[PDB]
Structures are given as structure tokens and as C-alpha cells.
């Protein structure tokens, strides 16, 4: 749908669009900008469009998760100036903590 | 090349070798040393196109004791004085030793293990958030294939050892790794008794003058670090280092890279390496070695020794063409759960990663689907945190010292010994080359550095390899000058 | 009953019998013809056109199913008018298309 | 009854290691179809090691000129394909096909 556009996206349009619906959104596509419109700029800008904006759409998909699940911490020591009485210690994460 | 394909035979025995015909015998007068024709009036790389000039021989070292020539110090000389040598130490069972063989000559390796591989760049924090689909992967492949994976690297061995023997996998699979690595420590300890320490001079104490492994400047064909170079300051402090990337001396490096400032087209002589896993993280110390130097000499042990003797030459690394494997790796589908519901094992169910329903075409979910993987959300999207660490492009570099202080004379510092090795690249396993459900020349292409990887069944997935190029290949290891 | 006929079935006929029955259609009659209305014609056109007929017999035979099933999707490379940006992975098809 | 099948052709035996070859057949039957291919693969290896590389005469290679089976003029009786021709035709392009 978005292919005919000088980089229209400019890493907004997909923090709009779940990032489940595109990949099949592009399948029913036919063929791209019949004029160059972009491509005059690298395609790599509009690859480091797409590749910086699916991140978001991923993590507004994401965001639903972190109440689904227990908020992650660190896994190194990360001497703190509290660590006293109280060595810090790792967490490998292997659990299950979506809570059922 | 076509024209006198010349150093190449290399099948003569001792009695041909030495015939009154060969129009190399001519060339043989120091053990210690290789003679051969040359262009004159050059001293460095200089272009990549080789200038005019009238032939001239010039002086090289011959390092090893494996150097040699084969019809001078043939195959049974060298695998009987192994005997010798390893007598009574570890030797790996049957069972191992089938395992990492099968897994060697199976061209059923998945793919999406190779990306996972590359995708991670060595990181301890890309790992540490990504454990479950490790297991989960490596798993479904061993339980069902009898097929370890996962021995395209030495940090990811160290990362799986060190923290996935505890139960998290069968007890044999991971007797597996365990056994590997303990052999190259084996290998590692045999070399204390070869050695007479004590004698430190130009900061190459005994354990390192004797041995390549042992050195350090003289690094791995692949890495992800910047060990190597920090422990090279510490040497090549009088044997005149040479740098060289991708055009530039200089190098410089960050701590840690962003998602944001991608420019997948760098031209500067740039390098990263993944984090400071603890201490500061920002321009008070630019640059923290990852580990000790015990990390290193036993880092490329494993390369030039193990992996070979493995692959029994069917090896050939490929540098990766990440363009089109950070764009594919965010194409997930992670269904939710409802807040009441509990979460599906089986592929029965409509929420479970893959069932019939979630398959979506052009969607990083295919993979699973072809190598018949198990995944959950829990384990799959875990992995977009690629945020915080990104490895951008692997690339070449020519590195170069002059020899040790055991051949230091007045006419052999004008014979340095020249070290070309990818960065972030990836060594690779037998190549398959005939299938279709993926595109060949997207992911990687081949790029030989060690005449040990220098296959050539690994060749035609270049664009245009046409036949009429592939003919030479199959006898000489083609590496970019 | 397309069989005292010169070809008559044609792929005009046959094609809107079931797939189920017709095996006891065909394996029913005995009669063969004494000047030949259904021979006249070779056998290699009678055949023929019986391939494609029982092939379009059965072909409609899912026709209904496909709103009970998977379409097929593409298996190989197959370089999509939008390759670009998107590399075009092809699917194993190996599961099953049993979803209710 | 433990036993392999489709070993009557060969594109049954290469598309099975590339295609069906992560799991969906039991190890013990899969195995089979791997080391048959391993066995061609080693048949192939003995022959370079059998031959000097480098002294190809008019094109065709070494192997082309020690062995009957890599001389890509010879024929395996079952043509599938029509590429075995087209090789035919882009090799013999001086021996009077």
C-alpha cells in the first residue's frame, strides 16, 4: 500500500500498523513505485526507515506483555553502592512468568 | 591465474619431488626459509593491481614445522608423530566423536540457526535475554535428529557450557560440549610440558615463543572482539605493526551501538563489539578488553585444529550480508494470551507459534516451519531486543607484525609476515547449494581467508559464478589478494 | 450414461457427476456397440477426453472444501515484484490444513 | 519392515536430504538416504585424488579426460530432465556429435 511514496513511512507510519498485518499486506501487493519515487536516495533509506520503525510496531505489540509477565532485571552483578550486606546475583531467564 | 597454474601440485611423492625434471628443485636451500619469483620494486600492498616490473625473488619465513612441503615430510611422518605424541591423553568415544561427524557432513543444517548465530555477534547480553529459545531450539533439533548444532563458534560454546549444563538439556547432549571443550583444554595443557619457562624476553614469555596458537598477534580468521588488537598492543611494542581497515590504518571503535543510527553503508574504518557488560559505559574508558588472554590462546585453537580435522575439508567461511537478515529477523508473529488463559504446547492450538493458522507468507515464522522447531511467545519475542546491541557489517582486515625476537637479524625485518581475517564474520559447514526455499545470494557469500576454507562446492552461490570459472577453483584456494 | 455416444461427454457432461460415484458408473454398463457409436472414433480420443473429463469430475470435488481449508501458498524463492526490502522466503508444506 | 524406499531413481534420494531432511521421518529411516549420499560423495572424491589437476586439454577437464563418469559427454541411461543435452551440446562442440 505504502510502496509509491518518497519514504512516506519516515519512521511513523508503522508505529500506527501492528506488525503482524503488514508482511501479509505485502504479499497481496503487484508491483512497486511505477516511477522511482524514492529510490532516487538509497533504498537504504527506506530500509533504514522500515528496519527502525518495525522495532516500535513491534513494541507497542509488545507493551500488552510486560503487565502478562514479571518485569525483568539484571543478570550481572552491577556492583551498586547498596550492594552491601547483600552481593547482588544474576537471573537466567528459562522461567515461564506469563501468569496463567 | 589460467596461465601456468603455478605453487599448486602439490600430490608428488619424495622420489618425483626430487627428480632431475622439476623445474621447482631449483628453489629449495634454507628449511627455515621459501623461495619464489616476485614483482620488484614493491614493498607493501600498495593497489590491488600488481604493478610492471621484471620477476625478482625475494625471502620468506617458513614458520611451522608443518609448512614444509608434503613430498619432503609426507602424511605418515606427521599423524605417526601425533601418535607419539598423544599417547594416553583424552580421546573422545565413539558416541561424540559419530555425533559432531554427522552433524559435520549433513547438509540438513537449519538455517535459522546460522542466523541466530550470527544475529547474537557474541554478545553477553544478547544471550543472557535469549537462553529460552536456545534450548528450545537446540532441543528440537537433538531430540529428534540425534544431532548436536551449534559448533559454528567458540564463544557460543563457552556461553552454552557455562550456563545450560545444569539440567536445562539432556544429559549426554550436553556431555557433548562438555567433552569437546575439555578436549581442546587437553590440548591446550599438553603444550605446558613442551615448553621450558622462565626466560621472558621481549615480553614473549616461553609459553608463547614456540607456538602460533600462543601468539598474539597473530589472530583467529573470524571474530567478534576486539581482544586480539588489545592483547597486540601488548606486543609488536618493538616488531613494527602494520593496521589496516578497509582503506585506513587507524581503527576506531564505540562502546555499544543503537537501533536508531543504523547507516548500513559505513565507510569509515569503524569497528564494535557488543558492551561493557559492567564498570561505566561512556567515554571515560573508551575500550575494555572482554576477557584474558587465556580466552584467546584457547579462542583460535579451536579454529585452526578442531574444525578442520572436523570437516575433513569441506569447511569455507561466508561473510553474511546482514541486509536482509535484521530486516527478515523482525518479521515475527507473537500471539497474546488472554489475561485468563494459560498457554498451548501442542501445534493444535490456534495460539501456539505454529499452528496451521499463524503461517503467513514472507514471514521470519517460515523457518520454524521448514527445520520443525517448538516456540512460545515467552521464547520468541525475547529476541527483538536487538535495540541495545546491533553488530552492523562484517568486513576484512589486513593486519601484519614482524617476526619474533627468535629470528630478529639484521635482514629479516624486511620479510614481514602479512595476517588477513574477517570481522564479524562466520565460518560455515558443508555448503548445500540445491535448494530453493530460500534466495541463495541474500544472506551470505562465500569470502576465503584459510587455505582451509577454501571449498569449492562453496562457490556458486556467488551471482554469476559461470562454469566457465568454476573449472580452476577445484585446484587452487581462492583468496581476494 | 455417456456411453452410446461419440464423445459426447465432450467435458461437457461427465465433469458434473460426483467423484465418489462415479467408479460404479463407469464399472456398470456391459454393452459394447455392434456398428460401433461410441468406437467410431479411436480409442485414443475417447480416453482422451475421458481424462480430462473424470479430471474435472473430481476437480470440483474441492471446491467446497476450500472454505474448510488452506490455500497454496508459494514454496520457492520467487522474486516478488516487491523482493526489495523483504527477502522472499519460500514455506515447506508439510502441515495440516485440518482448522476448525 | 524396516525398509527404505524410492532407491529405484535418484531425485527421490537427493530430494529427500534436501526437502525432508529436519526430522519428519525417523532418524533410523532417514540416515539411510544420508550415507548413500555420503557414499556418492566419496566415490566422487577418490576420483580428483586419482587425477592430476591442471592438464585439461581442449576443454575438457582432468576428470574429463581419466574417468568415463565425470566426462559430462557420457550418459546416464534415464534422462529425467533435457539438461544432460544441453551439456552434451555445450561439451563435444569438436568430436562430430
Same mark, same amino acid.
Given at each position: 500500500r505504502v510502496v509509491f511514496d518518497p519514504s512516506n513511512p519516515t519512521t511513523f507510519s508503522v508505529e500506527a500498523?501492528?506488525?503482524? =498485518?503488514? +508482511?501479509?499486506?505485502?504479499?497481496?501487493?503487484?508491483?512497486?513505485? &511505477?516511477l522511482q519515487? *524514492?529510490?532516487? +536516495?538509497?533504498?537504504?533509506?527506506?530500509?533504514?526507515?522500515?528496519? +527502525?520503525?518495525?522495532?516500535?510496531?513491534?513494541?507497542?505489540?509488545?507493551?500488552?506483555?510486560?503487565?502478562?509477565?514479571?518485569?525483568? =532485571?539484571? /543478570?550481572?552483578?552491577? !556492583?551498586? &553502592? /547498596?550492594?552491601?550486606?547483600? &552481593?547482588? +546475583? *544474576?537471573?537466567?531467564? !528459562?522461567?515461564?512468568p506469563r501468569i496463567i | 591465474m589460467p596461465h601456468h597454474p603455478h605453487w599448486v601440485n602439490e600430490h608428488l611423492t619424495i622420489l618425483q619431488f626430487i627428480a632431475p625434471s622439476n623445474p621447482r628443485l631449483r628453489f629449495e636451500l634454507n628449511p627455515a626459509f621459501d623461495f619464489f619469483v616476485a614483482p620488484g620494486d614493491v614493498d607493501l600492498p600498495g593497489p590491488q593491481r600488481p604493478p610492471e616490473a621484471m620477476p625478482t625473488v625475494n625471502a620468506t619465513l617458513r614458520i611451522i614445522n608443518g609448512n614444509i612441503?608434503? $613430498?619432503?615430510? %609426507?602424511?605418515?611422518?606427521?599423524?605417526?608423530?601425533?601418535?607419539?605424541?598423544?599417547?594416553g591423553r583424552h580421546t573422545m568415544t565413539?558416541?561424540?566423536?559419530?555425533?559432531?561427524?554427522? @552433524?559435520?557432513?549433513?547438509?540438513? #543444517?537449519? @538455517?535459522?540457526?546460522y542466523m541466530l548465530e550470527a544475529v547474537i555477534h557474541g554478545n553477553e547480553r544478547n544471550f543472557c535475554a535469549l537462553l529460552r529459545l536456545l534450548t528450545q531450539c537446540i532441543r528440537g533439533y537433538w531430540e529428534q535428529s540425534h544431532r548436536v548444532a551449534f559448533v559454528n563458534n567458540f564463544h557460543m560454546l563457552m556461553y552454552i557450557t557455562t550456563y545450560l549444563g545444569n539440567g536445562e538439556l539432556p544429559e549426554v547432549c550436553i556431555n557433548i560440549y562438555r567433552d569437546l571443550l575439555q578436549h581442546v583444554r587437553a590440548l591446550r595443557q599438553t603444550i605446558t610440558d613442551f615448553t621450558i619457562q622462565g626466560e621472558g624476553h621481549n615480553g614473549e614469555t616461553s609459553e608463547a615463543l614456540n607456538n602460533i596458537l600462543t601468539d598474539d598477534t597473530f589472530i583467529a580468521p573470524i571474530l567478534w572482539d576486539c581482544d586480539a588488537l588489545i592483547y597486540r598492543d601488548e606486543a609488536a611494542r618493538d616488531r613494527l605493526p602494520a593496521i589496516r581497515v578497509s582503506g585506513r590504518n587507524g581503527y576506531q571503535a564505540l562502546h555499544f551501538v543503537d537501533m536508531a543510527g543504523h547507516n548500513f553503508q559505513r565507510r569509515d574504518n569503524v569497528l564494535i563489539h557488543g558492551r561493557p557488560v559492567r564498570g561505566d559505559t561512556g567515554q571515560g574508558i573508551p575500550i575494555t578488553p572482554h576477557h584474558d588472554r587465556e580466552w584467546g590462546i584457547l579462542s583460535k585453537i579451536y579454529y585452526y585444529i578442531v574444525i578442520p580435522a572436523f570437516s575433513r575439508g569441506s569447511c569455507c567461511t561466508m561473510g553474511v550480508r546482514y541486509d536482509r537478515l535484521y530486516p527478515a529477523l523482525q518479521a515475527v508473529i507473537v500471539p497474546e494470551i488472554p489475561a485468563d488463559e494459560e498457554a498451548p504446547t501442542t501445534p493444535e492450538d490456534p495460539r501456539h507459534p505454529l499452528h496451521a493458522h499463524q503461517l503467513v507468507p514472507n514471514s521470519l515464522n517460515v523457518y520454524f516451519h521448514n527445520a520443525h522447531l517448538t516456540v512460545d511467545g515467552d521464547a520468541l519475542l525475547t529476541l527483538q531486543e536487538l535495540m541495545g546491541d546491533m553488530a552492523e557489517r562484517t568486513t576484512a582486515i589486513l593486519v601484519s607484525s614482524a617476526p619474533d625476537a627468535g629470528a630478529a637479524t639484521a635482514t629479516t625485518r624486511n620479510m614481514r609476515i602479512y595476517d588477513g581475517a574477517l570481522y564479524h564474520g562466520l565460518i560455515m559447514m558443508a555448503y548445500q547449494a540445491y535448494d530453493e526455499t530460500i534466495?541463495?545470494? @541474500?544472506?551470505? #557469500? %562465500?569470502? $576465503?581467508?584459510?587455505?582451509?576454507?577454501?571449498?569449492?562446492?562453496?562457490?556458486?552461490?556467488?551471482?554469476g559464478m559461470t562454469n566457465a570459472r568454476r573449472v580452476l577453483a577445484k585446484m587452487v584456494p581462492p583468496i581476494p589478494p
Open positions: 500498523i501492528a506488525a503482524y =498485518t503488514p +508482511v501479509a499486506l505485502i504479499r497481496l501487493l503487484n508491483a512497486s513505485g &511505477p519515487p *524514492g529510490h532516487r +536516495v538509497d533504498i537504504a533509506d527506506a530500509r533504514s526507515i522500515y528496519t +527502525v520503525g518495525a522495532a516500535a510496531s513491534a513494541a507497542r505489540a509488545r507493551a500488552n506483555h510486560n503487565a502478562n509477565t514479571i518485569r525483568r =532485571t539484571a /543478570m550481572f552483578a552491577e !556492583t551498586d &553502592p /547498596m550492594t552491601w550486606l547483600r &552481593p547482588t +546475583v *544474576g537471573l537466567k531467564r !528459562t522461567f515461564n | 612441503p608434503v $613430498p619432503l615430510c %609426507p602424511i605418515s611422518f606427521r599423524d605417526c608423530r601425533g601418535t607419539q605424541l598423544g599417547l565413539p558416541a561424540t566423536i559419530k555425533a559432531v561427524k554427522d @552433524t559435520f557432513e549433513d547438509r540438513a #543444517y537449519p @538455517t535459522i540457526f534466495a541463495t545470494g @541474500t544472506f551470505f #557469500y %562465500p569470502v $576465503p581467508v584459510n587455505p582451509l576454507f577454501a571449498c569449492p562446492e562453496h562457490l556458486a552461490s556467488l551471482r
